């Protein structure tokens, strides 16, 4: 509609960079994702979500990864923004051999 000579790509890339975090290599196979539970009152707690990486999705600010784990007999899937402040550090626990990019079949 307004025909301004603009590279929206870079304008966006510009904003997103001060909100983008690089994490260890990780493609599937196990990860201890140590997250911080600030909300437990005014007190800041520490929890650790460890399980298989089922998906990796997005780029820049929007980049995320999905971790699946069986905890107390019931299945749990958690999705994390790489650049989330409540995420402290992700750590590769054991590298996995996989033939695809999504792993959703592991849900059965």
């Amino acid at each position: 509609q307004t025909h301004i000579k603009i590279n929206r790509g870079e304008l966006l890339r510009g904003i997103e960079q001060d909100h983008t975090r690089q994490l260890p290599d990780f493609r599937p196979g196990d990860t201890v994702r140590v997250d911080t539970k600030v909300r437990e009152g005014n007190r800041t707690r520490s929890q650790a979500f460890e399980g298989v990486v089922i998906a990796i999705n997005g780029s820049g600010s929007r980049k995320s990864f999905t971790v699946r784990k069986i905890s107390f007999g019931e299945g749990v899937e958690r999705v994390f923004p790489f650049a989330s402040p409540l995420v402290n550090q992700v750590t590769i626990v054991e590298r996995g051999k996989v033939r695809r990019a999504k792993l959703y079949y592991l849900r059965e």
């Binding site: 301004i4 929206r8 304008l11 923004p81 402040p85």
Partner: protein
């Protein structure tokens, strides 16, 4: 009152404290002041601002004169902002401030002809218990012999979208002047690379 013209750039994810904020990146570029409208000359108080630069060749003589009378250098868009004065040539610096609630207005992405279901919400009909009128089709357009008419204003299928929409009390999250950028919490109407009009909150809460 206060106002600016810009181009919707896009939507991204940002964090302020620990909370993730959906932001709409807007280029509220420099807006030259092209005409001042006074009660003495125009009968009302307002300002004509301009937005995207136009190649001199592409501009016609009538627009050349109008731009020359203010020594501006052709824009492409020209909008008026009522009860707004501040001297010089309008930029977001001190016009807007982080935290300010604003009223961003654009032109909704137009969706051509749309049925009463998509356009008015409707309900359509049964998918199975014997139809002909399966999903979209409105019901009864009226009554019987009394108003031999169908009510004026009746909700019916038509051209949906490509309309003026003002979204109220949007929060100002970040401002990068010189980069001529302004981040707004939430979604502004219209498509990327479209004209937006950022004004001071119409009636702030």
């Amino acid at each position: 009152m206060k106002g600016i013209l810009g181009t919707k750039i896009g939507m991204t994810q940002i964090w302020k404290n620990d909370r993730a904020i959906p932001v709409t990146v807007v280029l509220a570029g420099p807006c030259p002041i092209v005409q001042r409208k006074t009660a003495q000359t125009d009968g009302y108080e307002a300002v004509q601002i301009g937005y995207a630069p136009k190649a001199e060749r592409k501009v016609n003589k009538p627009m050349q004169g109008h731009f020359a009378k203010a020594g501006v250098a052709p824009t492409r868009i020209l909008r008026e902002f009522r009860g707004f004065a501040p001297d010089g040539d309008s930029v977001n610096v001190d016009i807007f401030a982080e935290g300010e609630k604003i009223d961003a207005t654009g032109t909704s992405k137009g969706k051509g002809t749309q049925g009463v279901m998509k356009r008015w919400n409707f309900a359509g009909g049964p998918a199975s218990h014997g139809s002909k009128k399966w999903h979209r089709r409105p019901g009864s357009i009226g009554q019987r012999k009394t108003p031999g008419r169908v009510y004026k204003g009746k909700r019916m299928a038509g051209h949906m979208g490509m309309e003026r929409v003002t979204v109220q009390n949007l929060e100002v999250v970040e401002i990068r002047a010189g980069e001529n950028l302004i981040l707004v919490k939430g979604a502004i109407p219209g498509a990327n690379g479209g004209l937006v009009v950022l004004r001071s909150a119409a009636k702030a809460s």
